[PDB]
């Protein structure tokens, strides 16, 4: 499922930094119960950066086993070398995931033609649906609407998570792609605006701690009831901002711990424990949302 | 050494995308003859992003073998995960390299405290000298002078490659570190300016194809002969700019092939072959520098 | 009238640089006939910068005389000194204009508190409605939503022309102001998006040459018929971009001359005549819009 | 001269907002005693934006009278309209000023060809030496090195105040102009660096309150004594930063009052009185420099 509120799920860890199965089960049950549309497993918010390939596959497989067919799972699968991206994607074929979230090559700053070849080749070598992920603040490269237009013609490239926060991209892309191509916000603070402009949903950090309100907001937006969705969005707006007061997923993991959703807020270096000042800003945002 | 003209050497490839030993030997001999001070092996310009860790080590080991003690070799060794950077660096202990060029975590955008802990931990698990590498346009992370100052206190963190192109950083860092911390430019176009402000050399892309000019420029600079140095700079300025006309190392590999320094200009996806327009551009720059 | 398609009208000049009454009459008749909502006289596109105070008042008065009650007129009235802004605004009280478009102080980069005091004082000293004008690319200062919220409480401050092109500002502002506060786009390329997000109209450059299509687009947008408005917007999008291929109003004046709407395309230094390359880009945009 | 430490002098005011002759005399005597090289009268820091053209001329004439030939006086003379800049400059012909600091048109964002024609026309209608002034953060216009090169050929365009803080510009301009074109910094924080790269002095805000230190810094710099110069720079660096804690000249006028150099810190709207927090900040900077 590729519409509505999709959670960019944390990968909960014990005090040693290893994946905590009990905490993950608690999160998945929460998402099933709260009407979340799907789970992105080992995306950015899932510390894709710091898990080894074994861990990355283990977390996705554990998420699928725990979900037990109750909610669809999308795996985070990008890489900055095209042969690697292909390789890692093969490993998930027939896993039970419904799709892959594949980021633009980071660090090596490819041309638009390079991006076209990269993603075309990934898609050629799988039957899985691919969702392109554009996040220039992290990767140093910006997948432009024209190139998204070229890629949307590839049968298996089915949508984009547009994380620039630049709302002009919504209708620049829409006009170049077919009506079944999915446009998903990757910027919680601008996501309601994104849907009002014609976007189809959000791949959300805030959804980790406010799943029901996120799922209701996105349904109201889909129905056209923007004034009603905006009431919910105004209560969540402090979280949408303050979950990035320190690098993601530091604040959201601390919030999940405070709510009792995970056992510990531990992350892997170079992510650091939340500062005291951060804890206070996040807890005030949680109170604004009505969660504490 | 860690001073003068240090080449960010290309990883020359065959048509299959694997390292070409004959071409690498030819380059290394060229650098020895040209007066280059050191070689950074499998840094950014050497396609660190698209070699796997074994391929990367094979290139470094081959480069050391071929250098045969005639020219010092520094290995590119970043990772965006701290545990992984430590293992990946450990592999070169007792290899023969003289130090490591370690990049700031890319994509995950750690805090300055996070950067401090990452580099401190790397430095504690090795005896090799570490040169920090700041290139926010690629990494989405900017290692600020205050943090460099804190890290320069760690015994084996010995210098920085400052690739922002922001010349104010030279004296901001110089005032916070001891007189033997090395400051190197990572931006060819501003490197002579960077040395004029107090920097000690440059880790250069342009040096791949103008090694003698780059070494003579840097010697003059170190001797305080800036007007003289600048005449050489003006001759090379179109190269300093146009070797980034398309994403590095696309232009510089073509240039190396056009000069007879390597057998093929092949790169790995998502890097693409140079366009016709890019060729003409780089060819005019080579003509300007007197190399063609 | 402060809703719909409002034209940022050129000030047509003869070959000597003096205002051309016959050309101005032709434009005003065209706007009356084409369903434009109102005319902004001597705004940015009207070369407010280069007219002396005598000329500025003369053009507004001539525009009012020629309009003859058929279309409302808004005068451009900003200044970067608060006493001056007050002074110039007094001169239009009882003129027959319906309102003033008052820009944020340019060059001196005031604080948000400074902006608050500036605009509060202007509004205090007139009965005329004031429309705030935010255009940081021109002024060096950015009137933020919080400050717009404070100013919207002043009885006479009735709306804003938001020219950043940053579409997140629409609902940031809306939520802080009352439902009768008018939100007007000042960025033709993003103006339809702006209205879809809840904006009320556009103060438009494109409207100078495509008045009817602009007026129909804005009415469809007001009715909620965004798919229909977007068809028109897609035909106008080359003009929305290419009217800024050289500094405004250079391209739009050349376009008005090409259509026969004004006698000459003359501007005042430091605005320069359109280049040949500019003429060709603009004429292709006009053909795309169906106007040539 | 047009070299060494040149003060961008405040226009001290009474509580009514008009020039305070007693305070201006005291400042001018202070500069003569301190070794300042020249005074820029009614530039940016002198509130050029909020004086009318007569008030501006009165200040310049009073400054010359009070200077009594002891220290050269340059007048701020920009306009964003070419015809107006020419008239406004003509007024100072035979006044006694030694030259004019003429700003790039603000707000109307002319092309480089437009900037060339504007400055060329100004220079042709006067015999006074013109110093170009590039400050895109205030003007929205960036006068590029290539254009400076073209303008430096005009006999009485004699130098540039480069207030971008972009240190690469020093050598880009120096390579295109003759050895007697003057390059001055307009950014206190980077001015010593700018001189280290080949610049000839600074038009300084900090010099209002640390005139002796600034003059000694600039002498040392001109003599090649950069380490010595830098010790003075480090003492003044918090001032160089915090005199812009709130919009210039809000901090520097408060500082002048706190030092007993002027009678009141009054400014004209939209400049606002300094906040309590800003006072404490600037006071700590003054303490650091040893001036309080
Ligand atoms: K498709
Ligand atoms: K050290
Ligand atoms: K109001
Ligand atoms: K000259």
UniProtKB/TrEMBL annotation, chains A, B, C, D:
The keyword Lyase applies. The record marks 44, 107 as: Part of a proton relay during catalysis. Its main location: cytoplasm. The active site is at 133 (proton donor/acceptor), 161 (schiff-base intermediate with substrate). Belongs to the DapA family. SUPFAM superfamilies: Aldolase. PANTHER family: 4-HYDROXY-2-OXOGLUTARATE ALDOLASE, MITOCHONDRIAL, DIHYDRODIPICOLINATE SYNTHASE. Pathway: Amino-acid biosynthesis; L-lysine biosynthesis via DAP pathway; (S)-tetrahydrodipicolinate from L-aspartate: step 3/4. CDD domains: DHDPS (cd00950). InterPro entries: Aldolase_TIM, DapA, DapA-like, Schiff_base-form_aldolases_AS, Schiff_base-form_aldolases_CS. GO terms for cellular component: cytosol. This is 4-hydroxy-tetrahydrodipicolinate synthase. Homotetramer; dimer of dimers. Its EC number is 4.3.3.7. GO terms for biological process: diaminopimelate biosynthetic process; lysine biosynthetic process via diaminopimelate. It catalyses: L-aspartate 4-semialdehyde + pyruvate = (2S,4S)-4-hydroxy-2,3,4,5-tetrahydrodipicolinate + H2O + H(+). GO terms for molecular function: 4-hydroxy-tetrahydrodipicolinate synthase activity. Keywords: Amino-acid biosynthesis, Cytoplasm, Diaminopimelate biosynthesis, Lyase, Lysine biosynthesis, Schiff base. Catalyzes the condensation of (S)-aspartate-beta-semialdehyde [(S)-ASA] and pyruvate to 4-hydroxy-tetrahydrodipicolinate (HTPA). Pyruvate binds at residues 45, 203. It is found in: Cytoplasm. The record marks 49, 80, 84, 106 as: L-lysine inhibitor binding.
